[PDB]
Design a binder for this molecule. Structure first.
Ligand SMILES: *C(=O)c1cnc2ccccc2n1
Ligand SMILES: *C(=O)c1cnc2ccccc2n1
Ligand SMILES: *C(=O)c1cnc2ccccc2n1
Ligand SMILES: *C(=O)c1cnc2ccccc2n1
Lengths: 8, 8
DNA sequence: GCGTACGC
DNA sequence: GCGTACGC
């Protein structure tokens, strides 16, 4: 759920 | 030569 | 519940 | 001349 690339 | 992952 | 970020 | 970065 972590947004470091994807943002879900 | 750009270091944003790799660093060469 | 998915994918970003770059040039000596 | 290569590869990093993370969990609601
Ligand atoms: C957040 O913890 C999280 C964990 N697993 C995932 C798997 C696939 C897409 C997004 C996800 N987000
Ligand atoms: C971003 O797109 C992305 C893709 N894979 C990962 C793996 C581990 C940590 C962070 C990540 N971020
Ligand atoms: C830096 O500009 C640069 C450009 N191309 C590369 C290709 C492969 C590895 C490292 C590189 N660094
Ligand atoms: C870091 O490992 C990495 C890998 N691929 C890329 C593509 C485009 C811009 C930056 C990147 N960084």
């Amino acid at each position: 759920x972590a947004x470091v690339x994807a943002x879900v």
